[PDB]
Design a protein around this ligand. Structure first.
Ligand SMILES: N#Cc1cccc(-c2csc(Nc3cc(F)ccc3O)n2)c1
Length: 312
């Protein structure tokens, strides 16, 4: 027996809130696309759907896999999360939102102490995977992707939603590399913040100050440094715990490659102001990034091909 239904995002959000003892096989959830089909109110791994192939990635609180609905044959992505680490915000924050810059959820189904979150599969892979493959990305492609991420952030921030862990591993690419989109709202907050990836955390985060949407802007510029250098900020200069260094050192603008053009360096600096009051908004930074991209001649580099040496 189970209570898995087909429905809309608001219904899934209401159920998710009830997910927040002895481990059960309780099966409940809401599927948001007709391509994933409950069978007699159940939807269970190995019975109605299955994972296959190597891991597709790591996500917040759980691993991400390719999966297939056994009946429909539909392929999508799934993140499996233990119930005790599941954050409800992942299934509430984007309920009723739709943007080309946000990867759509396909639903979520609990099975005992596991929550399975379903999402559109993007064959282009993550931006993190691209950086690893290519060593690092040229300035024009980096600006192009940062701009699209910022477009997604504008959409969220106007709705008082913090993404909470903006980084290359959480930005997915279309099959031809032309479109980037934010995914993974495990650290999201509808404006207590649960910090994301240490290297990308803003000073106000490590200082335990009230966090707002500016946290995502600092993260996005750490992601920009990652694209450009091929490594996360701080890591090549510092050793152990980074929290005190983030709070105390100058913002990591020394990691901007000397080859970057003036508007590029300026944009990164504005997104990395230590005091969030002085830090650019998504709206502001997106405009600056667009001008920076125009000033280097627009997007010209092919999305793959030439390995570029990262900073050693
Ligand atoms: N498709 C795809 C793909 C490729 C590489 C990484 C990721 C990725 C990174 S975080 C991530 N989270 C996530 C994936 C889901 F399927 C459902 C909820 C999620 O939060 N996925 C997805």
């Amino acid at each position: 027996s189970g209570s898995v239904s087909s429905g809309q995002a608001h219904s899934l959000a209401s159920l998710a809130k009830t997910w927040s003892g002895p481990e059960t096989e309780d099966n409940e959830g809401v599927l948001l696309t007709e391509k994933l089909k409950p069978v007699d109110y159940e939807y269970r791994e190995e019975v109605h759907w299955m994972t296959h192939q190597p891991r597709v990635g790591r996500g917040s609180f759980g691993e991400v896999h390719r999966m297939k609905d056994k009946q429909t044959g539909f392929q999508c992505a799934v993140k499996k999360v233990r119930l005790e680490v599941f954050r409800v915000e992942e299934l509430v924050a984007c309920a009723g939102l739709s943007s080309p810059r946000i990867v759509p959820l396909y639903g979520a189904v609990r099975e005992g102490p596991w929550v399975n979150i379903f999402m559109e599969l993007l064959e282009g892979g993550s931006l993190g995977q691209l950086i690893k493959q290519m060593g690092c990305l040229p300035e024009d492609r980096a600006l192009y992707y940062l701009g699209q991420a910022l477009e997604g952030l504008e959409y969220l921030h106007t709705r008082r939603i913090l993404h909470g862990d903006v980084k290359a591993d959480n930005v997915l690419l279309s099959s031809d590399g032309s479109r980037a989109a934010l995914c993974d709202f495990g650290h999201a907050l509808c404006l207590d913040y649960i910090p994301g990836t240490e290297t990308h955390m803003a000073p106000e985060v490590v200082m335990g100050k009230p966090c707002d949407a500016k946290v995502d802007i600092w993260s996005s510029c750490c992601m920009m440094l990652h694209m450009l250098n091929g490594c996360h900020p701080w890591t090549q200069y510092f050793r152990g715990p980074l929290c005190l260094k983030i709070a105390s050192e100058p913002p990591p603008i020394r990691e901007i490659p000397p080859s970057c053009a003036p508007l590029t360096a300026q944009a990164i600096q504005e997104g990395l102001r230590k005091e969030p009051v002085h830090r650019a908004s998504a709206m502001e930074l997106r405009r600056k990034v667009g001008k920076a991209l125009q000033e280097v001649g627009g997007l010209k580099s092919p999305w793959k091909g030439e390995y570029k040496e990262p900073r050693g």
